[PDB]
């Protein structure tokens, strides 16, 4: 049910971009055809965790207070909230669009969703890819604004929307500022390459994944549920805070580790993000545990296209255990997260389940 | 032909152990009157698929691709095979009348086959039951020390057909101990169960179907199938686990659905499962799509000797669309497991025309 409302407004919402652009841009069909096939392809395919979770935050705080007027119950703001409920949904769904889009030009993907990068379609140059990339994201600005004018929350929930946006971009700047060592980086500067891999700490990774994903993953989504349930002072921000940084930090380790031992097939992207030297927890991990010798061979490995040094850094990782050292992470946070979530019952029952169901799809994640 | 030769060997079988039982373990005539009954009751009725697919396996590899030490094209061979093969049936038969009768008991039904269970029977006591069931299984060894003692592939036939029996009882205790939290799982402490229904992952329910169903009602019948055709060297074993796992998912999965929607008319008992409260395909997949509130419900009902309740869980399982899912499982299963069949069909027809007919008598499960 929820994927079937979810997916109506979908509908709705790309009517009133393209139609918007076609009756006041002065937009030829044709254009219209390219914009309607780009936001189809990089806003459809997915899980709508993001979502689907503001949905379900705000259908689950709907029960009690109902907002409160003078009605006995009325089943308009049933239907009101989860319109709103939906269109934040994709309002998040439009942003990691805009950032999944910047990323794979960033990362140089070639492959995610099973189907290749935007910017790798055959008919799409990367210039245009870029702006295609912008478009996405104001098109979240259109449509909120389209319906949430007369929203007394809407100065609210688009402030808080942007410093999440924000707080991801800072995010990709922890993120690709990882394999330089910090005190040289300066743009007039001469291409300083990777060369030791220090600041490859569990303490540098752990804030380059907080920014870079648990907000706008975990944080932005029960928050944005709140808001259109006018139910945000219902909740410990503290607690809840604890747990999309959790939730979130765990989130991403997943996609890093998935990076590495799963296969594309399942996957869909070809992982590569030894080859690309990214500061991944299995990375960091590693080289805090690992022998001086085994660091050494991994330095002479890492960051290679090579069909024998990759797999000689998965064997590092295979070898150290990197596997087992997941599994522990992996049921620390799980304890934890039920602590957290537990705090929240008491006073927030409601809203309480529905991080539970967000754990519920996280806890999985094998895709 | 097949039903025909499978229901006389019955007899023999029946007609030898009853004796071994009046002339070697000093058996009365009320006794024998009262085992043969059991027999009859537990181990007749159903369509013998398990114990005909052998057949199928045994009659179409003496004819596609045979066996090279048979000699040309005689009678005699044909006999041993066949009747070997229904011995193996039996055996496997045999050994599903163990574990139905004593899965009654554990699952607490009422009755099995439009009849009652075994223990379900008037001058049946739970007690002689749970013996009954033992006996069932010992019957399964012993005709196979008296038809296959000369037998050069009896330590083979009994080591696999004990793994595989191994890998049933594994399979229940993943079934019956999926009602509660796992970390909890200390003999020493009340057995409470779970609340949050953590337990129920698609993951989770996979795991207690491939080796609580898949391994003896899917591989077994096979891979006796080749033992007494002497034939299982000729074929990819790989491919065979494949599709056994795979028909075999989907055949409980089948049984699942069926548990909940099949009238117990046509069904053949009542629908146990929600009041069971089991882990079945239904719930994991409800609990995997539904939201928060719809969730919370189904807690509310799910697991209780209480019409009213019972309904409930029924109601929000297709109102939320739960058979779409299904035939949308049907489907990949369908194609996967017909890509599989033809890659079997590739260095190995006969066998493939075989596992085509089990799939053949799986796909278009009506019963
Ligand atoms: O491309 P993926 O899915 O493998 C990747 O994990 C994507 C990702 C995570 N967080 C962000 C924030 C902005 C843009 C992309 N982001 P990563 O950052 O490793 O490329
Ligand atoms: O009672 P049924 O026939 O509906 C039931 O399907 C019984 C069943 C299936 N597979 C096994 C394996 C061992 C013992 C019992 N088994 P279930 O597991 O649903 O209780
Ligand atoms: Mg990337
Ligand atoms: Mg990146
Ligand atoms: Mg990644
Ligand atoms: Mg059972
Ligand atoms: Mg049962
Ligand atoms: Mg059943």
Request: with cysteine; glycine share 4%; aromatic share 12%.
């Given at each position: ?49 993001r979502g689907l979770t503001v949905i379900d935050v705000a ?25 709103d409920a939906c269109?934040c949904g994709?309002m998040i ?127 932005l989504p029960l928050v944005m549920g709140?808001?259109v ?139």
């Open positions: 049910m929820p994927m079937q409302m979810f997916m109506q407004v979908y509908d709705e919402i790309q009517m009133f971009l393209l139609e918007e652009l076609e009756l006041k841009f002065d937009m030829d069909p044709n254009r219209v055809r390219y914009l309607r096939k780009m936001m189809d392809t990089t806003c459809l395919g997915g899980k709508y965790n259908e689950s705080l709907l029960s009690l207070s109902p907002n409160n007027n003078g009605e006995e119950d009325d089943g308009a703001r049933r239907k009101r909230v989860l319109h269109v994709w769904e439009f942003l990691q669009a805009h950032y999944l889009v910047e990323d794979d030009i960033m990362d140089n993907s070639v492959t995610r969703r099973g189907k290749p990068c935007w910017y790798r379609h055959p008919d799409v140059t990367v210039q245009c890819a870029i702006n295609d990339g912008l478009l996405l994201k104001s098109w979240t600005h259109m449509m909120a604004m389209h319906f949430f004018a007369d929203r007394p929350f809407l100065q609210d929930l688009l402030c808080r929307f942007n410093r999440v946006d924000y707080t991801t971009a800072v995010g990709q700047l922890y993120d690709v500022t990882s394999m330089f060592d910090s005190n040289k980086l300066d743009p007039d500067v001469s291409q300083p390459t990777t060369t030791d891999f220090a600041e490859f700490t569990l303490s540098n990774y752990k804030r380059i994944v907080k920014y870079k994903t648990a907000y706008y993953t975990y944080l709140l808001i349930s006018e139910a945000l002072p219902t909740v410990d921000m503290g607690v809840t805070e604890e747990l999309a940084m959790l939730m979130g930090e765990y989130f991403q380790v997943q996609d890093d580790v998935m990076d590495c031992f799963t296969p594309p097939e399942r996957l869909g992207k070809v992982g590569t993000d030894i080859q690309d030297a990214k500061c991944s927890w299995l990375a960091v991990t590693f080289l805090a545990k690992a022998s001086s010798a085994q660091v050494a061979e991994f330095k002479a490995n890492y960051g290679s296209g090579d069909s024998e040094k990759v797999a000689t850094v998965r064997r590092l990782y295979e070898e150290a255990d990197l596997q087992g050292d997941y599994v522990a992470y992996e049921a620390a946070v799980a304890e934890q997260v039920k602590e957290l979530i537990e705090k929240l019952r008491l006073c927030s029952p409601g809203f309480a389940a529905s991080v539970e169901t967000l754990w519920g799809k996280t806890y999985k994640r094998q895709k």
